[PDB]
Amino acid sequence: SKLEAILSQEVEAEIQALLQEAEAKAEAVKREAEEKAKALLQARERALEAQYRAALRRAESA
Amino acid sequence: MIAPMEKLVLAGPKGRAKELLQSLQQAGVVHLETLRPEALSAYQLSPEERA
C-alpha cells in the first residue's frame, strides 16, 4: 500500500540516518586511532634518533 | 424505517490517525468498533498521553 511503502521507507530512513551517524562516529574513531598511532610512531622515532645519537656519542667517547 | 448503517474501515500511519480521530470526533457521525483480533495491535497510545 501507499502508507505501507511510506512506513517502510520511514523506518528504513531512520535506520539509515542512525547507520550514517554511527559510521561517522566509527570513522572519527578510526581517525583518532590513526592520530594516536602517528603520535606513538613519532615518539618511537624520536626515541630511536636519541638512541642512535647516544650510541654515536658513546662510540666517539670510547 | 431501519437505516442502512454502512460500515467504514480506515487505516494509515499513527499521527495521521490522531488527526483523523480529531476529525471524526468533530465529524461525529460514525459509531466505533474494535475489530482488534486479526493481525492488529491494541493502540495503547502512551503513559504520557494517559497522564
From Swiss-Prot, chain A:
Top-level taxon of the source organism: Bacteria
Protein name: V-type ATP synthase subunit E
Known function: Produces ATP from ADP in the presence of a proton gradient across the membrane.
Sequence intervals crossing the membrane: none
Family assignment from sequence similarity: Belongs to the V-ATPase E subunit family.
Full-sequence portion shown in this chain: 2 to 63 of 188
Name of the encoding gene: atpE
